[PDB]
């Protein structure tokens, strides 16, 4: 509704399909002009650019999209552990922008180029 308690509640206790909207990010100039949207649900094949973190101004491929925790893994956006291993740093999608898309799916390519529907 409008109550802060019931707002965060819906965002946490959200069914898996409704967690799709929680992993949405803004589209580039070229892409907003082409598909008629402003944002898209980030996919594991997409390439993207970081706008807000310490890693702002770096590009990379989206390696994972965890709906459960509502965050994305991007290539080369790593953290060095104590044993020298480089583990990924979870990024928020609202801190990211899509440069290139993955249209490997016929249903996603159909949903984006249709003015009535939104992907």
């Amino acid at each position: 509704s409008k109550q802060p308690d019931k707002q965060r509640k819906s965002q946490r206790r959200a069914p898996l399909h409704e967690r799709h909207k929680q992993v949405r990010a803004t589209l580039s100039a070229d892409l907003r002009e082409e598909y008629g949207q402003r944002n898209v649900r980030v996919n594991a094949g997409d390439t993207v650019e970081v706008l807000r973190g310490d890693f702002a101004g770096e590009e990379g491929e989206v390696i994972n999209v965890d709906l459960d925790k509502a965050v994305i893994h991007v290539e080369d956006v790593t953290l060095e552990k104590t044993d020298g291993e480089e583990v990924p740093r979870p990024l928020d999608t609202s801190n990211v922008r899509v440069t290139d898309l993955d249209l490997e799916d016929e249903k996603r390519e159909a949903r984006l180029e249709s003015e009535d529907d939104s992907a």
């Binding site: 409008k2 109550q3 802060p4 308690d5």
Partner: protein, 246 residues
């Protein structure tokens, strides 16, 4: 007195007489009473559970075990106001009348007095509104209600030198206290009131702090928000006329 009418471009388009009710004495004492009686009337009834802390068969062991006569159950002190997990002594009640009655004439006269406080150019600047204009209130033609875009209303208010007010009421204060945890995190200054005649301005209502009204029901709160008189209102030619018989 005379009221200068304006067109949608911001230039003069004739003039009509400013009604008698704008010569009603500004009585902040009656206005403030009519606002406090309006605010308290929409306040919700609260109250703690009637049986809270009482859901126990706790009993005191009299005089003998070297302890104070406090009702106990399993070594824990229950019920009594002084004991932890006990009842509230004089708690907030649901049976309470949080509503304030106000005589019809006193409310009507207060509207009139608030409506009149809109005519004095000094009071409007004393209330807080930032503007550059001698004539107050702003009087616009009935062709105002036809506007749909808010960005065009801005251009009308920029032309009328009365936009420095929406520049003022843009900034938001983040309230100190636990009001945050209940929905009321923000607060913003009250600004311009757009009084129309047929339907409230769907075109203005999104402007920073701006409230919208109609002359058949424009109340003391709209005219004087928070009991403070002199709101920078903008009437429609048919509103200025209809507001007279109030």
């Amino acid at each position: 007195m005379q009221a200068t009418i304006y067109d949608l471009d911001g230039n003069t388009d004739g003039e009509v007489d400013l009604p008698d009710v704008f010569e009603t004495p500004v009585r902040s004492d009656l206005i403030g009473k009519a606002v406090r009686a309006a605010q308290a009337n929409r306040k919700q009834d609260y109250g703690s559970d009637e049986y809270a802390g009482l859901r126990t068969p706790a009993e005191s062991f009299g005089s003998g075990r070297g302890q104070a006569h406090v009702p106990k159950q399993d070594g824990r002190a229950r019920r009594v106001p002084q004991a932890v997990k006990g009842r509230s002594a004089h708690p907030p009640k649901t049976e309470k009348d949080r509503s304030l009655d106000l005589n019809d004439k006193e409310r009507q006269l207060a509207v009139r007095s608030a409506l009149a406080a809109t005519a004095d150019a000094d009071l409007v600047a004393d209330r807080g509104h930032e503007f550059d204009r001698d004539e107050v209130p702003v009087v616009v033609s009935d062709d105002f209600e036809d506007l749909v875009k808010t960005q065009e209303v801005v251009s009308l208010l920029e032309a009328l030198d009365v936009h420095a007010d929406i520049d003022r009421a843009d900034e938001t204060k983040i309230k100190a206290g636990q009001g945050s945890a209940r929905g009321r995190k923000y607060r913003r200054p009250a600004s311009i009131l757009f009084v129309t005649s047929d339907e409230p301005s769907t075109a203005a209502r999104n402007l920073a702090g701006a409230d919208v009204a109609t002359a058949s029901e424009v109340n003391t709160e709209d005219l004087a928000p928070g009991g403070a008189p002199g709101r920078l209102t903008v009437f429609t030619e048919s509103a200025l006329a209809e507001v007279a018989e109030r």
